[PDB]
Write a protein that binds this ligand. Structure first.
Ligand SMILES: [Cl-]
Ligand SMILES: [Mg+2]
Length: 209
């Protein structure tokens, strides 16, 4: 049972701008998704300080980066707080209408796309490199859900009967054909070292057979 929703018009406009602006510095998508994972891990850590049972769904707080050249996917997995169904539908827990407005104005005034995370809508930078994005998420207060979009103005949500996650968020980037450099170990390592060196959780880059 799959539900299809329209993006709010401002979010569709954000996505179109990310997809159709000429902008070479695409590697910042990974910094922005790792930043979102760090923020989600901080949230479950803070809740655990007063209620240790919040970690019954998994004590380890960390980030995995999983390239798969056969499937052409890069997956960013975290064991943070996760999202409810309502959060997914409401722009993946962001204030994206207001953040898009501000970002648009900042671009007009001379900012560039790499500054997206200052506007709270860094998730959508995934569309610099991905033709389709799938988000699998599990919050202590909800069931496991899958959100997916190939842009074009709509997204889907379904209950996920895939491999159970425990708690957290997994962002699966189905890469554009010309963006396969982001599956190469040396390239991923270089980007994590350049932009994510002060993230306070382990970031494990998986190896391929
Ligand atoms: Cl808003
Ligand atoms: Mg912040």
């Amino acid at each position: 049972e799959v539900e299809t929703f329209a993006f709010q018009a401002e979010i569709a406009q954000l996505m179109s701008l990310i997809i159709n602006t000429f902008y070479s510095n695409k590697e910042i998508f990974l910094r922005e998704l790792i930043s979102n994972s760090s923020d989600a891990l901080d949230k479950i850590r803070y809740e655990s300080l007063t209620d240790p049972s919040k970690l019954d769904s998994g004590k380890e707080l960390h980030i995995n980066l999983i390239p798969n050249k056969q499937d052409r996917t890069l997956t960013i997995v975290d064991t943070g707080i996760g999202m409810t169904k309502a959060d997914l539908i409401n722009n993946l827990g962001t204030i994206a209408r207001s953040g898009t407005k501000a970002f648009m104005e900042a671009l007009q005034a001379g900012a560039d796309i790499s500054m997206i995370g200052q506007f709270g809508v860094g998730f959508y930078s995934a569309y610099l490199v991905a033709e389709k994005v799938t988000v699998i998420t599990k919050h202590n207060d909800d069931e496991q859900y899958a959100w997916e979009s190939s842009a074009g103005g709509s997204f889907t949500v379904r209950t996920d009967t895939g491999e159970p996650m425990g708690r957290g968020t997994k962002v699966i980037l189905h890469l554009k054909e010309d963006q396969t450099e982001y599956l190469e170990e040396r390239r991923i390592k270089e980007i994590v070292k350049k932009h994510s060196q002060f993230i306070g959780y382990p970031i494990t880059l998986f190896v391929e057979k």
